[PDB]
Design a protein around this ligand. Structure first.
Ligand code: HEM
Length: 196
């Protein structure tokens, strides 16, 4: 089994080589990855970062961007995960196929985010913040990335205050999702790299 919803299905043909399995999986997740690249190019200040820092932000942050974008695949009420094919699998079945604490943590994350029911504009600006907030270990011009982060966070505060003048705490709640995403990213990378 391959219990990642970026796949078309969690079932693996055991008579395929590791390479064929990855190739097929890549045909499923690659369009999503390319969509994050096009999204990043549309953050105006992103293009002013060095080419190295652009690539490194995408390398570190693509997972967190997609986690936000695809939080709606996790239906906490139905306890189902929708895979990129549109097929749905119960949490129980996925656990029997080898999913565990990480899947549970993503449900918890998605439930809390899904429940905020952000508008498209709010979700899009939050996602920009997520990308530019990516792990900085690979970054050559930290101050430039921090400046862009600050600019986007200010825009997000302004948008949230417009849209939620009596619930400003939504802005703080969104910032507090950043270390949660970093945790999901760390745990997920461990699972990704352990895949045999
Ligand atoms: C291109 C991006 C991604 C790749 C290449 C990838 C790959 C993988 C691989 C190889 C595994 C281990 C599968 C197994 O052992 O059965 C995994 C686990 C998983 N991934 Fe992904 N993934 C990606 C993005 C995402 C995203 C964006 C999400 C959430 C929206 C996600 C959700 C999950 C879940 C729920 C698991 C199982 C967690 C558990 O074991 O409890 N993946 N991923």
């Amino acid at each position: 089994h391959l219990v990642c919803p970026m796949s078309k299905s969690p079932y693996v043909d055991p008579h395929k080589s590791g390479h064929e399995i990855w190739e097929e999986f890549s045909m499923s997740f690659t369009p999503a990855v390319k969509e994050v690249v096009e999204f990043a190019k549309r953050i105006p200040g992103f293009r002013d970062l060095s080419q190295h820092d652009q690539v490194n932000l995408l390398k570190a942050g693509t997972f967190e961007v997609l986690m936000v974008r695809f939080a709606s695949l996790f239906d906490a009420k139905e306890r189902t995960v929708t895979f990129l094919s549109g097929k749905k699998y119960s949490v129980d079945d996925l656990h029997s196929m080898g999913a565990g604490d990480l899947l549970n943590s993503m449900f918890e994350f998605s439930e809390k985010l899904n429940a905020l029911q952000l508008s498209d504009e709010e979700m899009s600006l939050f996602t920009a913040v997520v990308l530019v907030s990516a792990d900085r270990s690979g970054i050559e011009n930290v101050n430039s990335v921090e400046a862009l982060q600050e600019t986007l966070i200010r825009a997000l505060r302004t948008l949230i205050m417009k849209n939620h003048p009596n619930e400003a705490s939504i802005f703080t709640k969104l910032l507090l999702k950043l270390p949660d995403l970093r945790s999901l990213n760390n745990m997920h990378s461990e699972e990704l790299l352990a895949f045999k």
